[PDB]
Amino acid sequence: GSMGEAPNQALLRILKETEFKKIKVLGSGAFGTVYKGLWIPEGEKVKIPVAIKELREATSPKANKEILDEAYVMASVDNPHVCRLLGICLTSTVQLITQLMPFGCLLDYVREHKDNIGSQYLLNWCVQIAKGMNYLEDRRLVHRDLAARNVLVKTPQHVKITDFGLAKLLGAEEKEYHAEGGKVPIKWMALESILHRIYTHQSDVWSYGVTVWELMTFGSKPYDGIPASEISSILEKGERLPQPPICTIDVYMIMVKCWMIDADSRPKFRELIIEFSKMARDPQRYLVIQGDEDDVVDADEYLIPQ
Ligand SMILES: CCC(=O)Nc1ccc(OC)c(Nc2ncc(Cl)c(-c3c[nH]c4ccccc34)n2)c1
Numbered sequence: 240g241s242m243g244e245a246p247n248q249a250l251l252r253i254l255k256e257t258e259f260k261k262i263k264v265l266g267s268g269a270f271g272t273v274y275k276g277l278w279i280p281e282g283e284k285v286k287i288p289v290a291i292k293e294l295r296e297a298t299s300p301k302a303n304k305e306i307l308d309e310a311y312v313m314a315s316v317d318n319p320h321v322c323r324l325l326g327i328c329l330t331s332t333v334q335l336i337t338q339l340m341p342f343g344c345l346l347d348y349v350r351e352h353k354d355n356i357g358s359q360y361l362l363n364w365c366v367q368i369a370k371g372m373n374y375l376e377d378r379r380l381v382h383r384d385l386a387a388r389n390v391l392v393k394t395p396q397h398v399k400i401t402d403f404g405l406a407k408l409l410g411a412e413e414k415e416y417h418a419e420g421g422k423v424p425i426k427w428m429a430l431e432s433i434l435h436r437i438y439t440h441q442s443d444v445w446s447y448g449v450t451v452w453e454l455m456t457f458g459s460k461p462y463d464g465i466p467a468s469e470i471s472s473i474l475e476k477g478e479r480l481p482q483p484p485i486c487t488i489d490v491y492m493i494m495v496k497c498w499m500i501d502a503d504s505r506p507k508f509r510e511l512i513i514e515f516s517k518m519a520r521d522p523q524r525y526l527v528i529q530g531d532e533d534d535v536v537d538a539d540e541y542l543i544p545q
């Protein structure tokens with residue numbers, strides 16, 4: 240309890256609204272709306288595809304608060320497996336501008352390409368998502384909303400984590416974030432998060448296991464048919480998501496470890512990177528898929544806290 244805080248010198252970039260045009264709606268609902276768009280900086284021979292996020296809440300001040308908190312976090316992160324803020328645009332309700340991810344979210348992707356998705360892809364996605372989370376952990380960020388819908392696809396070989404609407408920054412030696420009231424997706428949440436509103440890097444790991452389960456089932460809904468109010472008592476009873484058909488015990492065991500009652504018994508993201516990348520060297524030994532396609536680890540898969 241002696242470490243202080245370093246200054247955050249991230250630049251917040253404010254973009255002119257005239258420099259980009261909307262093209263079509265990509266998605267919308269309660270959260271707000273996301274548009275596909277093209278950004279054309281003033282004195283340059285460049286056109287950049289972007290997503291334009293317009294969050295919607297009860298009032299404009301409410302939306303603007305939430306959206307500026309999200310811009311803070313996204314402006315502070317820079318990793319190949321995490322979405323990056325290009326900047327914000329100061330309309331009546333603020334717009335978040337980010338890179339367009341042309342293949343959409345990973346959840347819809349695995350649903351739409353179920354039949355042409357092999358073991359190599361699935362396992363590398365798991366590696367890449369873990370690399371993203373591990374980086375976020377090194378930035379002392381708890382994501383709190385990791386799910387297949389919140390993983391975006393730049394290319395089938397390259398995915399990035401998105402949606403920092405619920406993300407929280409921990410203090411220097413701080414371990415937990417205690418949430419107030421507020422909707423959070425119960426079916427991706429760790430038990431302690433549901434019971435006590437405690438969120439940690441290890442509660443993010445629980446969400447990761449559920450995200451991997453989504454991928455391995457080719458985009459099934461977790462605990463399908465079950466109402467959210469019944470979930471915590473199910474988990475308290477020791478019940479968990481079932482073993483996906485394509486999964487070997489080796490892979491299913493990793494998921495179960497992510498869903499341990501004891502948060503500190505769950506794997507660390509750095510360990511998941513190692514485990515999944517080892518598996519990715521021999522994909523068909525670990526996933527058994529219809530119509531598919533040394534202990535040595537590369538230093539880029541051996542990540543040490545920063
Ligand atoms: C799971 C649903 C899904 O993401 N669809 C989807 C389809 C097609 C796309 O590209 C042509 C994309 N590209 C994309 N690029 C950047 C962002 Cl920041 C978002 C994005 C963030 N939040 C969202 C909520 C709803 C829709 C999109 C987003 N999307 C996304």
Ligand code: NA
Nearest residue numbers: 514515517518
């Ligand atoms: Na392994």
